[PDB]
Amino acid sequence: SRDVLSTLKKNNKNTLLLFGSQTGTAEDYANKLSRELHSRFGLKTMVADFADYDWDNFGDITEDILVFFIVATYGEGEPTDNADEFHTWLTEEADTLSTLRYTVFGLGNSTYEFFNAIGRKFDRLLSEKGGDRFAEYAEGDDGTGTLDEDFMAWKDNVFDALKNDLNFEEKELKYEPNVKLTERDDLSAADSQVSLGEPNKKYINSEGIDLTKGPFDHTHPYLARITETRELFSSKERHCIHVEFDISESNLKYTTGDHLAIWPSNSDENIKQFAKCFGLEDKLDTVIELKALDSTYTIPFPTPITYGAVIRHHLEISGPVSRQFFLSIAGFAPDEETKKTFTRLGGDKQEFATKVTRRKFNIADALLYSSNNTPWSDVPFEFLIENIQHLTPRYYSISSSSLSEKQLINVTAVVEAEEEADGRPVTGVVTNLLKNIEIAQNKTGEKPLVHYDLSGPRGKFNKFKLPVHVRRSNFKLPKNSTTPVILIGPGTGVAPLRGFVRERVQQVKNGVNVGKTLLFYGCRNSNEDFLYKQEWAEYASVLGENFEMFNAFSRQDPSKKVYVQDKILENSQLVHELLTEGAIIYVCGDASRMARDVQTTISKIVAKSREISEDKAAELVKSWKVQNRYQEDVW
Ligand SMILES: Cc1cc2nc3c(=O)[nH]c(=O)nc-3n(C[C@H](O)[C@H](O)[C@H](O)COP(=O)(O)OP(=O)(O)OC[C@H]3O[C@@H](n4cnc5c(N)ncnc54)[C@H](O)[C@@H]3O)c2cc1C
Ligand SMILES: Cc1cc2nc3c(=O)[nH]c(=O)nc-3n(C[C@H](O)[C@H](O)[C@H](O)COP(=O)(O)O)c2cc1C
């Protein structure tokens, strides 16, 4: 069952789609492509996670399997955790792929240095080892917001290739369900077998089982009690939540610098608009059971389950709407006036961007706009279950020290919310959940923009619990305690750096010998958004001369912006001194602008301090990144 060639033969499949995904986008695309390949070309598709197979025999693959690689790039041009073992095999163990027929679409972000490293590497290596590239390589730029149209253009070119080079008959797209739904009027919330949205099937029965003993991962969260929350900003319109999770009654462990994954539930406001949009507002307590119609289709949540539990706890109903979604559901348009508007919107890239994407409509608002508020009654819920991605966990840099508090996890989450002129709320799913927990836990008297279910399924989230798991990072304090470190992280970039500073403080407290710690921080205003403002003096008083903090208040003076890079330039001789002593550089926070500005600044200080050209210094800083002498936690 770990042999992907055997699994292809047993399920009578001729098309493999492999996804390398961290936050689900690559998965969704594998899934969309699969159905459209099957519908339009009659190919027998199977979507496979790299992590579910071993690849030692992959070179044995025969010419009758068309392979599609949908692969995202992470870390410093690293593969996604799921793809890591496949990445090792190809680069290190793979000999030939003489009869592989493949094509590759890479997901990346061009604000990052190693743009689509994994897409390009794979597309190259597979060709070098004898593979037949049946459709041109393409790739997506999540940095410019073109990723979704990028994938769409690639898919069009892959259809051209199949029709015109492999000489395949192309039929129109039609919904071909991989799953069958049956309403169970004989079943209700009273029945213990029925999911009210628990994270997995191990949380639904669970009488003679300890749900506090792990292992905990992306398949199995721990329910962690939030023992403390505070608002960290002083501004009425902008919010950042300090969260304390208690893991003391569990086997969940983290190391300083690791990520916490927080499993979301959707907002009341969003669920209402969804249920309205598809006329399900009378059906949310109706139980359904799902039965797979394809041998390789996994049902993506526990069954049986209520409509409302699927929508609240399993479907990514909020987020930008793919134009591909309009093309897939258009068949189910309520009336002919809708059909005319909808096939025109779905067929026009620019008009779709102007009328759907730029207005920040959720699926619900976009379909209700198109149909002039007629419900999309004829949409089988099965279509929705296949064509809307699983609600995936959001990652947070742990801001606690595992040496200082092995038993607590802190995160530092800035809240993303706006209100449209029409009155629509556009909300970050996880961040507004945390703002909500903070408002409720502290009886603050603020009025939530959106509301969530803080008791969760059958009151199993009661005591302000969320489902979490820890994901190990490479973002680690140096092995040798004495190695100096340079910590740069404005705004919520400070989160993991608080973790680092708290660790080194506990190390000095433990009579350990600790290197120089330099921290560059930035925020708008020392009175407004200075994260953990009062802790730093306390940390200073324990670290003594071995700690120095430089703070860039970007709006303190309205006429002149001041950023960390400015504070770095004016302390350049200290910075370079610490680099001469082997200091490790840690840059955390905004990927899109700060990370690159800071990298340039460090390059300039290297260039002057060692009398080499700026480009030679930039190449030297880039090699520090490959060696892990320069480490980034930027999102
Ligand atoms: C390794 C890593 C570490 C991180 N560390 C931190 C950290 O320490 N602190 C931190 O605050 N964040 C951190 N992040 C970011 C974090 O994972 C989340 O992306 C962030 O908190 C927002 O998640 P959300 O679920 O609240 O918003 P999401 O639900 O993901 O929404 C994303 C954005 O889209 C908007 N939006 C909603 N609907 C639409 C629509 N229809 N059209 C367009 N836009 C829409 C939302 O308002 C929001 O602004 C980290 C990310 C990574 C990858
Ligand atoms: C922490 C982090 C690091 C990233 N590093 C890179 C990178 O080095 N190169 C790149 O091209 N894209 C990078 N990206 C962009 C992702 O590849 C992109 O968001 C992708 O569309 C996500 O795919 P997934 O949801 O399937 O995991 C990074 C994104 C994040 C959040």
Numbering used by the authors: 45 to 679
Copy text from the publication:
The structure is well conserved among the different kingdoms, possessing an N-terminal FMN-binding domain that is connected to a C-terminal FAD-binding domain via a linker region. The enzyme transfers electrons from NADPH in a typical order via flavin adenine dinucleotide (FAD) to flavin mononucleotide (FMN), which ultimately shuttles the electrons to the protein acceptors.
Both structures were obtained in the closed conformation wherein the FMN-binding, flavodoxin-like domain interacts with the FAD and NADP- binding, ferredoxin-NADP+ reductase (FNR) like domain. Despite the fact that CtCPR crystallized in the presence of excess NADPH, the open structure was not observed. No differences were detected between the two structures, with the exception of the presence of the 3′-phosphate-adenosine-5′-diphosphate part of NADPH, which, in contrast to the FMN and FAD cofactors, is bound through mostly side chain interactions. No density was observed for the nicotinamide mononucleotide moiety of the NAPDH, with the C-terminal Trp679 instead stacked on the re-side of the FAD. As the tryptophan sterically prevents the binding of the nicotinamide part of NADPH, movement is required for hydride transfer to occur. The transition between the open and closed formations could limit hydride transfer from NADPH to FAD, as well as interflavin electron transfer, as the resting state of CPR appears to be the closed conformation during which NADPH binding occurs.
